[PDB]
Design a binder for this molecule. Structure first.
Ligand SMILES: *[C@@H]1O[C@H](CO)[C@@H](O[C@@H]2O[C@H](CO)[C@@H](O)[C@H](O)[C@H]2NC(C)=O)[C@H](O)[C@H]1NC(C)=O
Ligand SMILES: *[C@@H]1O[C@H](CO)[C@@H](O[C@@H]2O[C@H](CO)[C@@H](O)[C@H](O)[C@H]2NC(C)=O)[C@H](O)[C@H]1NC(C)=O
Lengths: 92, 99
């Protein structure tokens, strides 16, 4: 969020005064950036713990355990389990 | 080049224009004399700009950096450092302006 533009819409009359509050404009960006930087660290450590990208063999005999729901859908342009797409519907 | 203030004087006048001064002389009969030697100099106009000033242990400023010089120079003014670590930094925003 750009403090200067948010507080003072595109107008120097207000922009001048904002200079008198000092870092309040900037340090917010530092706070927000502080959030948004680590927001990818979250997704970093949660999802990528894996050194290499595995992929299942072409043929599945697991002993009768049918994973074709959870495995990536080869046909969807974005390869995603049949289940995952249910989620992407339910959330907006 | 670091320039110390010589004298801070009460002038109180606006100066909008000027010219330099010269030292010439007279010569005597040869095939009056003027324009001793050659003369050339450099002139440039000032302008408000934000510089980051790096003093030395003895206060001798070496590195100065303008913030508005290029989109690269404006980020170094955000980190205040002359060393810029490998990565992405967010320089001041830009706006499209009305025609
Ligand atoms: C795993 O399950 C999927 C669906 O849950 C099976 O795919 C179905 O196979 C039948 C044939 O028996 C077809 O009539 C259906 O149209 C298929 N559905 C889908 C969505 O493709 C699959 O055969 C099962 N495989 C194993 C090894 O259990
Ligand atoms: C600086 O000196 C200039 C004179 O050169 C003054 O500026 C003039 O201001 C009038 C308006 O009052 C304009 O019509 C002129 O065109 C200006 N001069 C030029 C050369 O453009 C000015 O008054 C002086 N500074 C201050 C602070 O008064």
């Amino acid at each position: 969020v750009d403090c200067t533009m948010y507080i003072c819409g595109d107008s120097t009359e207000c922009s001048n005064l904002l200079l008198q509050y000092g870092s309040f404009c900037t340090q917010l960006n530092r706070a927000l950036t502080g959030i948004a930087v680590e927001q990818d660290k979250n997704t970093q450590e949660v999802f990528a713990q894996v050194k290499q990208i595995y992929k299942t063999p072409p043929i599945k005999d697991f002993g009768g355990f049918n994973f074709s729901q959870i495995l990536p859908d080869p046909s969807k342009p974005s390869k995603r389990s049949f289940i995952e797409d249910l989620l992407f519907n339910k959330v907006t | 080049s670091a320039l110390e203030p010589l004298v801070d004087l009460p002038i109180g006048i606006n100066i909008t224009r000027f010219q330099t001064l010269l030292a010439l002389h007279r010569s005597y009969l040869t095939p009056s004399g003027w324009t001793a030697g050659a003369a050339a100099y450099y002139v440039g106009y000032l302008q408000p700009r934000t510089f980051l000033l790096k003093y030395n242990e003895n206060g001798t400023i070496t590195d100065a950096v303008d913030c508005a010089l290029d989109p690269l120079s404006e980020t170094k003014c955000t980190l205040k450092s002359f060393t810029v670590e490998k990565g992405i930094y967010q320089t001041s925003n830009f706006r499209v302006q009305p025609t």
